[PDB]
Amino acid sequence: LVPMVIEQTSRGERSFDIYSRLLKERVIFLTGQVEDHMANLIVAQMLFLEAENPEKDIYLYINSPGGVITAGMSIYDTMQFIKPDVSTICMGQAASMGAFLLTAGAKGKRFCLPNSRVMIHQPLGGYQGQATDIEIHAREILKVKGRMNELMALHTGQSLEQIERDTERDRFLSAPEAVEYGLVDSILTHRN
Amino acid sequence: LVPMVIEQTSRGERSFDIYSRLLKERVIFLTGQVEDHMANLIVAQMLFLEAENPEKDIYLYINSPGGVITAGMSIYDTMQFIKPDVSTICMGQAASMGAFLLTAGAKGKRFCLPNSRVMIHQPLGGYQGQATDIEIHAREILKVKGRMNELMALHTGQSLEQIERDTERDRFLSAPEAVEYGLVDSILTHRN
Amino acid sequence: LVPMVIEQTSRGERSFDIYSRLLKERVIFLTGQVEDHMANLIVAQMLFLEAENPEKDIYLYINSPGGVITAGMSIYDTMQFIKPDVSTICMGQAASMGAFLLTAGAKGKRFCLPNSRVMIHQPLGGYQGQATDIEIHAREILKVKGRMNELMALHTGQSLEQIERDTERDRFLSAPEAVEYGLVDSILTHRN
Amino acid sequence: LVPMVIEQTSRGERSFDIYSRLLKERVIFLTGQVEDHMANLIVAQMLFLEAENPEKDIYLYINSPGGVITAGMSIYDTMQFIKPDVSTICMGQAASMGAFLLTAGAKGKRFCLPNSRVMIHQPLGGYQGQATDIEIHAREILKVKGRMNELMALHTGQSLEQIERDTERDRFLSAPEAVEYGLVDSILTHRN
Amino acid sequence: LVPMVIEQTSRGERSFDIYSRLLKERVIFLTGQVEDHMANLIVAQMLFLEAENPEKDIYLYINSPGGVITAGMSIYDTMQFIKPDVSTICMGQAASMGAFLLTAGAKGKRFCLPNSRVMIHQPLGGYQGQATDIEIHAREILKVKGRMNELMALHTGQSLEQIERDTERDRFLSAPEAVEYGLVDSILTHRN
Amino acid sequence: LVPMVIEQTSRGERSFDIYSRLLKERVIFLTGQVEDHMANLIVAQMLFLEAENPEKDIYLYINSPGGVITAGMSIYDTMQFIKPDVSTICMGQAASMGAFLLTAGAKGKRFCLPNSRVMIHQPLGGYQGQATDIEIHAREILKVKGRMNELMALHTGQSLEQIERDTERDRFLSAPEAVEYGLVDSILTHRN
Amino acid sequence: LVPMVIEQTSRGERSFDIYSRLLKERVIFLTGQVEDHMANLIVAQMLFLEAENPEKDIYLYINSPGGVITAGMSIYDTMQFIKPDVSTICMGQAASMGAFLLTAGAKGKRFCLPNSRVMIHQPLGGYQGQATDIEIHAREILKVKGRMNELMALHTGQSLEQIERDTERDRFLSAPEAVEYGLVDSILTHRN
Amino acid sequence: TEAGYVGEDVENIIQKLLQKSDYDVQKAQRGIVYIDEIDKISRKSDNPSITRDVS
Amino acid sequence: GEGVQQALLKLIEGTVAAVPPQGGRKHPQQEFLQVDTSKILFICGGAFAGLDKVIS
């Protein structure tokens, strides 16, 4: 079902996958709901690029409606830990986790298309059980919310209190509106 | 099952999938519902074709019953971004997003079959929760409709008000009617 | 399971699929209910055959219980569009949509097996919603029904009124009777 | 799982699956319920053998419990159409369609193992709808029964009246009993 | 998952399947419920091995819990039809049909493991509908029961009356018990 | 999903799956519930290994929460039958059948890790039907329970009566406790 | 889908898997719920690395929400058994079993990312049946608590009493908080 | 090599034997010969008969 | 490959080689000058790219 392509060179012909062919050019696709399997797979792609060349930029195209918080934060530590710069591109939709991974890109390399939508909200969770257990999980998710906002405000450059009000509830923002918040640095409309 | 085909070349014979064979010829197939996984796949194909020849036309055959709006806006930005002209052909059925992607092609390269069906309507959606959240989502979908209609009027050429009146409900149009409305530039009946 | 066959030429041995092997001989199989994925696949097969030899005839085997109408019209436009003559053969069963693609073949090159069964009826559909929306789809499908009958009469050589009266309800026609109606030209009994 | 075997040839050794390997020796397997997908696969195999060697007999095994009539009537037209004789071997189970495809084999090349079972019944159907439509389906299905009964009489040698009294209800017949009706010619017990 | 192994030969190294690798040594595995699909797979292996070298004995393992009787009789006819002697080995479990294939092996070449278990019972079935049809099916299954017992008595050597008495109800038999009944010839405990 | 590895050879190198790679070193993995399908697959591995080297040892890692008894007996017979000694290692969990296969290894070659759990219990089953049929099954399962206990006492060395009272109910045992019973001979904590 | 990558070597070029490619770098990924099927796969990976280089370090990325405890002991005993030092990395999420495998690394090589969540709780279980069976499981699972707490206390360096109070209920810990307990020795914020 | 090819021929063997015999045909007709490396001219039975193996 | 190796097995050891017809002043060709190679040292050098792996 997935189309295959060939890269013609002096050595000969080699058949590559459409998604695999782009990975050679340091391009990663984040499609669908966020989960442990897809998130771990993306991490492997990041490490492989680091091994090949720790000095070349990495391109991350994000298109997701959001997902698990723990799975999403795994990628953030991977982009900031390795030396290569990670470019984040918002395409179509970007939720709390998708937008969190968007502003986490390299400064001056965060792009977003004009007809794109970005949404941000506080993290979600829940727990059923004894009262003392709910207090532990309730206290934990609060740390996640505050911890995540601190990173959003730092990369954006906005203030923590202002971000809290914006992320208190679902906040939809367009491409030009995103630049004002600081989530992105520029908008790509046409080549040159 | 998808059959295989052999392509005779200078180096010898290479095997490709039926879809892969057409991909080599700058032809992409848009079949089924429009979702994130399919859209990201089509985007990778479009960008791939740009590298091989940024000056040659690209053929996009559209046959879909519709889908998510976020996915469509992602592809629309790609057509306007990349330098080569994209030729959009509607075969079979074309819904709201299929039609929007159909008129986003290069001016003068939009074709349509005599027995092809084109359907256009306003965006769909919904939200369940508190009134404050509903108000936010209500304004979000409203902006999308205005953003989509403004773009639809540009390619078609009709006034913005006309798009609103005609899109209040499902509007079905044939190949000849599409030309008058401006959704297409010509009709293909027979070769030459 | 699809078996693998060998094709001998003076280039090296090549393993092909039963369906892929027949594709090389300008033979296409139409199996199962008509839908978007199978229709776009068959359309690509037709476009690939005309690249090799757009003058030789293309064989089309029709064995289906019917399906979506929009999907069928996509193929019909393709058959009447390309230059080469498409030979249609009725094997197994041919429903409303399947019969439309049978008589759409090249004049004088439409065949049917002695025990093949054909069925024709007006298109089906339905819509649930507001009354105004029902009227839109009721008028839309009516255009399709009359549009199909016009095409059916043209290829069969019959009158548009006779088609409507006969297609008002399901009509089963035998192979020898199909020749008189005009859906086919001759019948295949033995290899002469 | 389908195991892979190797065949030694002058050019070299090649690995083929068990089912494909037998196709090379003009042996086709008919297993499971009869439908369009399995029928189109089997008919394609038969045509391939005709092109490779139209003078060598073809072996058709039948270990199916029955199925769709329309799907099973296409193969019958293919066996009587092609020049080479199609051998039919009853192996385990043979229902209405299996028996119809067992007696249609080349006269003098029909076999049935000692512990093989043959079942013959009249066509089964059913329709839900208006009385007028039920009447149409009743008239058509009444022809299918008579049509199939006539073909059995031609290959067995029995009178049409006797066939009607023996096929009205399910009739189970053993291999020795089938030889007296005319469905088969001899019974395979050993090499000689 | 099925593991892949490599076989070193004079012509070089070939990578086979674990199940397919043993097939070269005239060994076939009968695992799982007996159905039409698995029966044709086992039958084909027997015929394919016959062409290679019809002088070496064939080994057939049986670890089936039972199944349909029509598909099982197809295999029994194949074993007694071909020239070579088929050695049947009971591994783990052998039900009514699983036990009919064990005693149907070459005399003196039937083995059973010490902890293997065998079960024998009369055929099972049923039918719903008119009493007339039930009567026809009832008379057929009686022939199967009487026919299966008759064949069992031939290989085992026990009187037909004793088989009928013991097969009326489910009978469990251990490996040593099977030797006295005649189902098996010897018991394999340790190599050499 | 399944990782691929390479085995450097003098002539060159070929790629193998992780499970097949260890199989070359006379190592078999028994994961998950025991059933007919995996049992026949493992028996092939054991039989295949003795052919390549009838004198080298075989390693069997078992981790399974029990399973079918009949399938288990097929494996146990294989280990006690073939000439080479088989090493058994318990990793994490070992149920009634898992423990029986652990103590069935060769003397002085039955290992288990320090943090491993072993459970032993009597066989369990059921049968619904007439009272006479239930009685037949109750007698057989009793033989299975008694037979299994006799074999356990042989390898462990404990008395038959002690085994019966210990396995009458669920009995959880750790690695050191297993040595006292006689299930294992040594414990692996660190290399050398 | 998992993308493929090509590795260039003097002998030539072969296409490796993304997870298989990183396996050469002594990097293993633990994703999803812990279970017997997935646990054995990781165990085989560890043993493979030990053979290739018993001295070089091993990198283990742990991102799991927990799973079966018995499957974990199969892995923990493997890490402490082999000669090479296993580096445990806390990526995204680490539950009771995941945290246990995080502190099982070599001393001074247990790293954790800044934005990572670690949770430690009490073992979970249950049983349904007679009272005698229920208490048997209670005594066994109780040993697991002390057995796991003792091992967790050894690597962390804390007293058993302190661990019991912490593991009594779900205890969520962050990267800096984890260092106080002793689970980890350093934090991975940026390479070098 | 076979006759009619750039390679050697099977008649030079007699020339050598003659020189040793001092061109005494009668002596050479009752001489001994040793053909070494007779295992390198084996036929590749696995290959199809598509070319004359003069070697 | 093997074909060339099979021809040197007697040159390195010693045999009455069949020198080419003429590559010097010598005018005729049928002469086929005879020479013995039982006292002629024969050095052979190569790079054997890959042998390092075989050894390991």
CB G119 within 8 A of CB G170: yes
Question: Hey, which residues of C are catalytic here?
Answer: 96, 121, 170
Compute the distance between CA of residue C57 and CA of residue G22 in angstroms, rounded to an integer.
52
- Work out the minimum CA distance from C36 to partner chain D, whole angstroms: 17
Positions of E strands within E19-73: 27-31, 58-63
Q: Which of D11, D36, D78 sits opposite C31 (nearest CB)?
A: D36
Q: Is F121 a catalytic residue?
A: yes
Residue B66, by phi and psi: left (phi above 0), alpha (psi -120 to 50) or beta? left
Compute the distance between CA of residue C42 and CA of residue C78 in angstroms, rounded to an integer.
10
In this structure, which amino acid lies at residue G46? Answer: M
Compute the distance between CA of residue E68 and CA of residue E36 in angstroms, rounded to an integer.
8
CB A124 within 8 A of CB A102: no
Q: Which residues contact A140 (CB under 8 A, 6 or more apart)?
A: G117, G172
Q: Look at residues D76, D14, D24 and name the one whose alpha carbon lies nearest to residue D48.
A: D24
Residue E8 CA to its chain's centroid (Å): 32
Q: Which of G13, G22, G61 sits opposite A48 (nearest CB)?
A: G22
Choose, from A74, A85, A121, A166, the residue flagged as catalytic: A121
Reduced to 3 states, what is the DSSP secondary structure of residue E140? helix
- Work out the minimum CA distance from A38 to partner chain G, whole angstroms: 9
Q: Taking CA atoms, what residue in G is nearest to A52?
A: G7
Q: Which of G45, G81, G151 sits opposite F189 (nearest CB)?
A: G81
Q: Which residues contact D191 (CB under 8 A, 6 or more apart)?
A: E81, E82, E83
CB E34 within 8 A of CB E71: yes
The residues with which B58 forms a beta bridge, in sequence order, are: B86
Compute the distance between CA of residue G137 and CA of residue G147 in angstroms, rounded to an integer.
15
| Superfamily of structural domain G4-187 | 2-enoyl-CoA Hydratase; Chain A, domain 1 (3.90.226.10)
CB G63 within 8 A of CB G91: yes
Are residues D169 and E136, on separate chains, in Cβ contact within 8 Å? yes
Q: Look at residues B4, B2, B23 and name the one whose alpha carbon lies nearest to residue B15.
A: B4
Question: Hey, which residues of G are catalytic here?
Answer: 96, 121, 170
Reduced to 3 states, what is the DSSP secondary structure of residue D66? coil
Tokens of A53: 């060349």
Q: How far is CA I19 from CA F121, H23, I33, I37, in A?
A: 87, 21, 6, 11
- For CA atoms B137, B139, B143, B145, the dihedral sign is positive
- The long-range contacts involving F1-9, CB below 8 angstroms and separated by at least 24 positions, are F1/G2, F1/G19, F2/E1, F2/G41, F3/G17, F3/G19, F3/G20, F3/G23, F3/G41, F3/G45, F4/G16, F4/G17, F4/G20, F5/G20, F5/G23, F5/G48, F8/I53
Q: Taking CA atoms, what residue in I is nearest to G12?
A: I50
DSSP letter (8 states) at residue D3: -
Residue E104: phi, psi to the nearest 5?
Answer: -85, 20
Q: Taking CA atoms, what residue in E is nearest to F54?
A: E191
Q: Which of D36, D82, D147 sits opposite C191 (nearest CB)?
A: D82
Tokens of B154: 């540009």
Q: Kindly report the three-state secondary structure assignment for every residue of D107-132.
A: CCCEEECCCCEEEECCCCCCCCCCHH
Number of C-beta neighbours around residue B131 at 10 A? 8
Solving technique for this entry?
cryo-EM
Number of C-beta neighbours around residue I43 at 10 A? 4
Q: Which of A61, A117, A191 sits opposite B70 (nearest CB)?
A: A117
Q: Which residue has the tokens 């105004």?
A: C132
CB E48 within 8 A of CB D22: yes
Return the residue in F10, F11, F13 with the most chain I beta carbons within 10 A, the one to mutate for interface testing: F10
Contact list in I for residue G10 (CB cut-off 8 A) is: 49-50
Q: At what angle do helices D69-81 and D96-103 cross, to 10 degrees?
A: 10
Contact list in E for residue F36 (CB cut-off 8 A) is: 31-32, 63-65, 92-93
Compute the distance between CA of residue B99 and CA of residue B112 in angstroms, rounded to an integer.
11
Cα atoms found within 13 Å of the Cα of residue E167, Cβ hemisphere only:
28
Contact list in D for residue E81 (CB cut-off 8 A) is: 113, 188-191
Q: Are strands D117-120 and D86-94 parallel, antiparallel or unpaired?
A: parallel
Q: How far is CA F146 from CA B35, F143, F151, F152, in A?
A: 61, 5, 9, 10
Residue G83, by phi and psi: left (phi above 0), alpha (psi -120 to 50) or beta? alpha
Are residues I16 and H16, on separate chains, in Cβ contact within 8 Å? yes
Compute the distance between CA of residue E2 and CA of residue E19 in angstroms, rounded to an integer.
8
Reduced to 3 states, what is the DSSP secondary structure of residue A93? strand
Question: In sequence order, what DSSP letters do the residues of C108-149 get, joined into one string?
Answer: T-EEE-TT-EEEE--------S-HHHHHHHHHHHHHHHHHHH
Q: Which residues contact H20 (CB under 8 A, 6 or more apart)?
A: H28, H31
Return the residue in C13, C31, C59 with the most chain D beta carbons within 10 A, the one to mutate for interface testing: C31
Q: Which residue has the tokens 């396996």?
A: G23
Q: Look at residues A140, H23, C83, D166 and name the one whose alpha carbon lies nearest to residue G170.
A: A140
Compute the distance between CA of residue B141 and CA of residue A172 in angstroms, rounded to an integer.
10
Reduced to 3 states, what is the DSSP secondary structure of residue E119? strand
Compute the distance between CA of residue A36 and CA of residue G30 in angstroms, rounded to an integer.
10
Widest Cα–Cα separation across chain B: 67
Tokens of E97: 């049909």
Chains in contact with chain E (at least 3 beta-carbon pairs closer than 8 A): D, F
Q: Is E20 a catalytic residue?
A: no
Entry field: residues in chain G: 192
Tokens of A132: 């003392």
Return the residue in B9, B89, B91 with the most chain C beta carbons within 10 A, the one to mutate for interface testing: B91
- Work out the minimum CA distance from G91 to partner chain I, whole angstroms: 37
Contact list in D for residue E143 (CB cut-off 8 A) is: 174
- Work out the minimum CA distance from E27 to partner chain D, whole angstroms: 12
Q: Look at residues F123, F16, I53 and name the one whose alpha carbon lies nearest to residue E13.
A: F16
- D-proximal residues of E, 46-85, CB under 8 Å: 47-48, 70-74, 76-77, 80-83
Q: At what angle do helices E160-167 and E131-156 cross, to 10 degrees?
A: 120
What residue spans define the domains of chain F? 4-187
Q: At what angle do helices B96-103 and B131-156 cross, to 10 degrees?
A: 40
Q: Which of A21, A92, A114 sits opposite B39 (nearest CB)?
A: A92
Reduced to 3 states, what is the DSSP secondary structure of residue A186? strand
Compute the distance between CA of residue E75 and CA of residue E61 in angstroms, rounded to an integer.
13
Q: Taking CA atoms, what residue in F is nearest to E115?
A: F73
Reduced to 3 states, what is the DSSP secondary structure of residue B64? strand
* Cα angle for residues C172, C178, C182 (degrees, 5° grid): 125
Q: Taking CA atoms, what residue in D is nearest to E70?
A: D92
Contact list in I for residue F8 (CB cut-off 8 A) is: 53
Q: Look at residues C123, C154, C128, C155 and name the one whose alpha carbon lies nearest to residue C140.
A: C123
- Work out the minimum CA distance from I37 to partner chain G, whole angstroms: 38
Continuous H helices in chain F: 18-24, 36-52, 69-81, 96-103, 131-156, 160-167, 175-181
Q: What is the resolution of this structure in A?
A: 3.7
Q: Which of A2, A18, A92 sits opposite B48 (nearest CB)?
A: A18
Tell me, yes or no, if D154 comes closer than 8 A to chain E by beta carbon: no
Q: Which residues contact E84 (CB under 8 A, 6 or more apart)?
A: E49, E50, E54, E55, E56, E57, E58
Reduced to 3 states, what is the DSSP secondary structure of residue E134? helix
Q: Which residue has the tokens 């073909």?
A: D151
- Work out the minimum CA distance from E77 to partner chain D, whole angstroms: 7
Contact residues of G toward I, CB < 8 A: 10-11
Compute the distance between CA of residue E188 and CA of residue E181 in angstroms, rounded to an integer.
17
Q: Which residue has the tokens 């060998």?
A: C6
Q: Look at residues H27, H26, H32 and name the one whose alpha carbon lies nearest to residue H13.
A: H32
Compute the distance between CA of residue G87 and CA of residue G84 in angstroms, rounded to an integer.
10
Q: Which residues contact D52 (CB under 8 A, 6 or more apart)?
A: none
Are residues B4 and C20, on separate chains, in Cβ contact within 8 Å? yes
Compute the distance between CA of residue B144 and CA of residue B7 in angstroms, rounded to an integer.
45
Q: Do chains C and D touch (3 or more CB pairs under 8 A)?
A: yes
Reduced to 3 states, what is the DSSP secondary structure of residue B57? coil
Reduced to 3 states, what is the DSSP secondary structure of residue C93? strand
Choose, from F57, F74, F85, F121, the residue flagged as catalytic: F121
Compute the distance between CA of residue C145 and CA of residue C73 in angstroms, rounded to an integer.
12
Compute the distance between CA of residue E135 and CA of residue E132 in angstroms, rounded to an integer.
5
CB F93 within 8 A of CB F65: yes
In this structure, which amino acid lies at residue F76? Answer: Y
Q: Which of G3, G29, G93 sits opposite A70 (nearest CB)?
A: G93
Tokens of F115: 């943090």
CB D187 within 8 A of CB D112: yes
Q: Look at residues A51, C175, E105 and name the one whose alpha carbon lies nearest to residue G21.
A: A51
Compute the distance between CA of residue F73 and CA of residue F50 in angstroms, rounded to an integer.
19
* Cα angle for residues C75, C78, C83 (degrees, 5° grid): 145
Are residues F36 and E174, on separate chains, in Cβ contact within 8 Å? no
Return the residue in F29, F59, F91 with the most chain G beta carbons within 10 A, the one to mutate for interface testing: F91
Contact list in C for residue B32 (CB cut-off 8 A) is: 36-37
Q: Kindly report the three-state secondary structure assignment for every residue of chain I.
A: CHHHHHHHCCCCCCCEEECCCCCCCCCCCCCCCEEECCCCCCCCCCCCCCHHHHHC
Compute the distance between CA of residue F114 and CA of residue G76 in angstroms, rounded to an integer.
10
For D84-103, letters b (16+ CB in 10 Å) and e give: bebbbbbbbbbbbbbbbbbb
Compute the distance between CA of residue G55 and CA of residue A57 in angstroms, rounded to an integer.
33
Compute the distance between CA of residue C14 and CA of residue C118 in angstroms, rounded to an integer.
38
DSSP letter (8 states) at residue F2: -
- Work out the minimum CA distance from D71 to partner chain E, whole angstroms: 19
Contact list in G for residue F12 (CB cut-off 8 A) is: 11
Are residues C44 and B19, on separate chains, in Cβ contact within 8 Å? yes
- The long-range contacts involving B149-158, CB below 8 angstroms and separated by at least 24 positions, are B151/A115, B151/B76, B151/B100, B151/B104, B152/B100, B152/B103, B152/B120, B155/B103, B155/B104, B155/B107, B155/B182, B155/B183, B156/B103, B156/B181, B156/B182, B156/B183, B157/B182, B158/B182
Contact list in F for residue G84 (CB cut-off 8 A) is: none
DSSP letter (8 states) at residue B152: H
Chains in contact with chain I (at least 3 beta-carbon pairs closer than 8 A): F, G, H
- B-proximal residues of C, 95-124, CB under 8 Å: none
